[PDB]
Design a protein around this ligand. Sequence first.
Ligand SMILES: Cc1nc2c(cnn2-c2csc(C(=O)NC3COC3)c2)cc1Nc1c(F)cccc1Cl
Length: 346
Amino acid sequence: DNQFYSVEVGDSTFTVLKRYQNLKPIGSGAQGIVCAAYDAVLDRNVAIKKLSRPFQNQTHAKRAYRELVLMKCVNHKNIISLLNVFTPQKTLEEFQDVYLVMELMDANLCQVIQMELDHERMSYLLYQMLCGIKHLHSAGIIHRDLKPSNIVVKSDCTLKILDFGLASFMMTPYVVTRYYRAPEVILGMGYKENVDIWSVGCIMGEMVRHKILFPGRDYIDQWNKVIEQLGTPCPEFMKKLQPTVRNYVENRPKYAGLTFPKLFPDSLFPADSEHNKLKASQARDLLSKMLVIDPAKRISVDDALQHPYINVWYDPAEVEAPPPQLDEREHTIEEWKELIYKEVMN
Ligand SMILES: Cc1nc2c(cnn2-c2csc(C(=O)NC3COC3)c2)cc1Nc1c(F)cccc1Cl
């Protein structure tokens, strides 16, 4: 009669409501482990993510808490929406794990990126990204760590952003992925909404080139890859760095940076018909307005949406949805436990 049951998926134990059957592993989420399942109440397939003792330290706690209050606020077809949240534990004192449940998708954007994609599909995924990002901004959320591994797609080309970005020790095995973070993030710069444009450009460029644009062990290597390719930023951009970070950067070797046709030659694009030739040059134009070091001359999110490569998909019902207490804290682990628990028990 217990309303829960336990199954072994991979290494992790999943204790879930009886409505969820046939759990099968599917991926890794750092914040937790994930599985596919059939939801018999809803008669549809779902994905279930287990957050193990999210209160065990401030990084897991802040993230877990932050994302519960937002998934309980945002509402947009391209942004994760939760179907259920639950814990199999009965009291706060026993409270351990949190399970999040959402619509089951077909692929992670890392998988899509390795595929050869026509312009119809590339422009559509990117357009969805910008729509989701635009919603986040309308809700007062600026992401600042959008990356492909936290983006999922359905076979029909529909897309969802699964996380809400940055707010820091992590005593774990797994590394954080930093290749898509804007310069202002790399350099401790302060930022505005089009910080997220940079990351879109990084994703789009990788779609074209099929390799990470700015790899590196550290922000050191990564900045090297940025200037080697795009050219040293404008002195005007220097003047906005902090003095110490400004000294480091100004003392880096100078680079002219390659043109975008060299950074993304026609070889990479479908360019057999006239239609495709024009699409490639539009694609390269957009890339050139997104992969821009100085945020001041980097294209907006609303301006990107209305770029010719992108605005073929326009619909005032998807770029124009209504946006619905600011939590911003730092607590002990028992404090975090109760705060998360209350939210789990809305
Ligand atoms: C890591 C992760 N992957 C997810 C989803 C949804 N789809 N996928 C997904 C990625 S590959 C794949 C697949 O191969 N599907 C085929 C079709 O049959 C098997 C499905 C969600 C998360 N994370 C997550 C969550 F599960 C619940 C609540 C909050 C969050 Cl953030």
